[PDB]
């Protein structure tokens, strides 16, 4: 169980690399909500009440919340929310996603990890490989 | 908006009538979980962490929580949870449900109300009429 919290932390570190690459074109005037592909809006959980943060905010606040939870079932929630950073990038920032993935395989590695430890429902794994 | 909280309270009162009828055969040795029809278990929200209460407990704790919230989006959550009392009775206590519904039309009245005020997704309205 201790390795579960541990390996997740390295993922959050590299996921910051993706978030920094994204903030060059994922802006709140155009990515006004956190979405991936269907008619779902995702509400940012880093607030007293879940909030319709723009995608860039959702990304930052969620990574921040995960980094905070880690240095201190809860794993499943963090993983589900972190994964949306990948799905938003894959569907709305495909070029940046592709560049970053070809260099790090981060989404691949993260997907194998949440499946290896049963941390997300397979139904939520909508990004290929 | 004030009528929304108000009409719900009368529903919770009559829903206590159903809960009292159910407690004659909905026991925790046989209804060990709160379920309706599919492979979903419903976790009781009247606890610090959602709990796998037996159906009778889920029913009582949820009605109790709704009565408390009322005399003091939140409406949607209460409605969704209260509705499971109907679906559990309909699928696992069909005779009691049928007797009570023929006398009160409570599920009918409740369903029309949550649709009238858009308080539950229609996807969750699995009990007929």
């Amino acid at each position: 169980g201790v390795w579960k919290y541990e390996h997740l932390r390295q993922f959050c570190l590299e996921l910051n690399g993706l978030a920094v690459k994204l903030q060059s074109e994922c802006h709140p005037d155009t990515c006004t909500q956190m979405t991936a592909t269907e008619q779902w809006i995702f509400l940012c959980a880093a607030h007293k009440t879940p909030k319709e943060c723009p995608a860039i905010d959702y990304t930052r606040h969620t990574l921040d919340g995960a980094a905070c939870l880690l240095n201190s079932a809860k794993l499943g929630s963090v993983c589900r929310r972190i994964y949306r950073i990948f799905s938003h990038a894959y569907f709305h920032h495909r070029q940046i996603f592709d560049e970053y993935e070809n260099e790090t395989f981060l989404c691949h590695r993260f997907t194998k990890f949440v499946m290896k430890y049963n941390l997300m429902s397979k139904d939520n794994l909508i990004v290929p490989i | 908006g004030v009528w929304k909280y108000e009409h719900l309270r009368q529903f919770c009162l009559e829903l206590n009538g159903l809960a009292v009828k159910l407690q004659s055969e909905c026991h925790p040795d046989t209804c060990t979980q709160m379920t309706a029809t599919e492979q979903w278990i419903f976790l009781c929200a009247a606890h610090k962490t959602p709990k796998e209460c037996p159906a009778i407990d889920y029913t009582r704790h949820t009605l109790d929580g709704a009565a408390c919230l009322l005399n003091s989006a939140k409406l949607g959550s209460v409605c969704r949870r209260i509705y499971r009392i109907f679906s559990h009775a309909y699928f696992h206590h069909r005779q009691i449900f049928d007797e009570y519904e023929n006398e009160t039309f409570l599920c009918h009245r409740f369903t029309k109300f949550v649709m009238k005020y858009n308080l539950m997704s229609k996807d969750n309205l699995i009990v007929p009429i």
Binding site: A45, A73, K74 | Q39, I41, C44
Partner: peptide
């Protein structure tokens, strides 16, 4: 962040 899951799908 914080979590409050009230529906679980049976294995």
């Amino acid at each position: 962040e914080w979590s409050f899951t009230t529906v679980r799908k049976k294995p």
